[PDB]
């Protein structure tokens, strides 16, 4: 053909490479109600939604991979459809602290509410809605 | 209270060189660069938006240990997957393997495999 269009849809995944696999999973599924699943070789991922976050163990991580792979290194924004108020007070009950929020931010489709915290390896998360 | 997330919204990629970045990701995947609010630059996709951070500029809050090529990222695609590899590949882009059957959020996936600029793997996927 000529003149090709490359397009992207979405993000269906992305990789962590974490300092302990048991740890942040538990976070992941406490803090943000996430699914740990098996899948493959004995491998882990976080599911939301229909997309995912696969798992790497820092120091046992699978090939090809990041060029350089880093603890901490992430920085996410997740929307949720739960009452923003009631999440934070979710992730508080955790004992999680919040950071900073609710505030306005910027979002892919336009103005959102956040509010921010870390996960265990120092990762930035972002808890955002794009309801009033 | 049922916590649930719905999907990811955007992240945040560290770069070493902005104007290198945007040049590849609208050239090789066919993303829309943009700005927004104060010399802020985000990459736009479906529904989503990576925003960039040069290495060694300031902002708060981020990333515990920033740095460049440490992200890993599966990538759908609608178009015909043999159609994007010629097109990735005639960008000047190595393909490092594809296609090849690997696996998605929601199922088996056919993808292939490249890095960008500064080393992030780009694994770009078909569910067809
Ligand atoms: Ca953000
Ligand atoms: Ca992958």
Do not use: L, P
């Given at each position: 053909g000529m003149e090709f269009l490359m397009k992207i849809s979405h993000l269906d995944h992305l990789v962590l490479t974490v300092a302990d696999i048991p740890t942040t999973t538990n976070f992941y599924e406490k803090v943000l109600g996430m699914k740990a699943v098996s899948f493959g070789a004995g491998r882990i991922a976080l599911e939301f939604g229909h997309q995912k976050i696969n798992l790497h163990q820092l120091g046992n991580e699978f090939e090809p991979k990041a060029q350089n792979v880093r603890v901490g290194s992430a920085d996410l924004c997740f929307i949720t459809d739960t009452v923003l108020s009631d999440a934070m007070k979710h992730v508080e009950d955790?004992?999680?602290?919040?950071?900073?929020?609710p505030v306005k931010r910027t979002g892919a489709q336009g103005a959102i509410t956040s509010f921010y915290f870390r996960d265990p390896d120092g990762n930035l998360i972002e808890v955002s809605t794009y309801s009033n």
């Open positions: 955790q004992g999680v602290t919040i950071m900073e929020g």
